[PDB]
Amino acid sequence: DLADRFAELERRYDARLGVYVPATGTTAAIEYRADERFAFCSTFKAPLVAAVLHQNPLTHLDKLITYTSDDIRSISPVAQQHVQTGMTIGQLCDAAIRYSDGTAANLLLADLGGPGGGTAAFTGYLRSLGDTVSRLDAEEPELNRDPPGDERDTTTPHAIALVLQQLVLGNALPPDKRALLTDWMARNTTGAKRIRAGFPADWKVIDKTGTGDYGRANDIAVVWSPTGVPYVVAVMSDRAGGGYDAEPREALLAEAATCVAGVLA
Numbered sequence: 001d002l003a004d005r006f007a008e009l010e011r012r013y014d015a016r017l018g019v020y021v022p023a024t025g026t027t028a029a030i031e032y033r034a035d036e037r038f039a040f041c042s043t044f045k046a047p048l049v050a051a052v053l054h055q056n057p058l059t060h061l062d063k064l065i066t067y068t069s070d071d072i073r074s075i076s077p078v079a080q081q082h083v084q085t086g087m088t089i090g091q092l093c094d095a096a097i098r099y100s101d102g103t104a105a106n107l108l109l110a111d112l113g114g115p116g117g118g119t120a121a122f123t124g125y126l127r128s129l130g131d132t133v134s135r136l137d138a139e140e141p142e143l144n145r146d147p148p149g150d151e152r153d154t155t156t157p158h159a160i161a162l163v164l165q166q167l168v169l170g171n172a173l174p175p176d177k178r179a180l181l182t183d184w185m186a187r188n189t190t191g192a193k194r195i196r197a198g199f200p201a202d203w204k205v206i207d208k209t210g211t212g213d214y215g216r217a218n219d220i221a222v223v224w225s226p227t228g229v230p231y232v233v234a235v236m237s238d239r240a241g242g243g244y245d246a247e248p249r250e251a252l253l254a255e256a257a258t259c260v261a262g263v264l265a
Helices: 003-013 041-054 058-062 089-098 102-112 119-127 157-168 175-186 250-263
Strands: 016-021 030-032 204-211 217-224 230-238
Touching (some): 041 102, 041 119, 041 175, 041 204, 041 217, 089 175, 157 230, 230 250
Antiparallel strands (some): 016 030, 217 230
């Protein structure tokens, strides 16, 4: 049916494509490879900000964090500019969502405390939203490098979409914290060529991207139709066959999001 197209795209770009758009009162539920495990990569950075938000007061956003040049290990465009002054918890939230800052992600994990530097506490947080499948085991940048077939640091389209839906459209957070999250995802700068590129311009789009090795490119989004009806879109992909240094094809996610737009029209 529509699952014919998705394997047409897989065939074309050399990928494993996974998609999930939850069912709404008015539409079916799009699923392709929906419950197979794909790597989080940087898509975890969004439920991480919600985790900090959920368990701390808004005054906590002003607490100042200091760090060293030794702490800067991954792609970190914002953390390298304030290595001397430090960044507050709140600025690290902004940096982690809108620029995908790898170092603010490691710092915000450490602010969740617990064994292994906050990865135990984080998965524990996803479990409170009912998600028993996803798991985070490492930090940045290693959480991007697990071999294909390893269950460490993996989620599924089905799983991450239902979590995101509770965080943006649901009751997982009170409104004051809820609007902070949504605004950051709404002014994201890294997904302009992925899901955002596949929907017409009068659809409003918030997203948070992921990229890793083995050609891994993901994008999780919340979208609004020209008349205001919201849907949640989960799109993930890797290219295990091509090898560790395989290149990610973002036009693959842009096209598969067009396919979603057609059924929702």
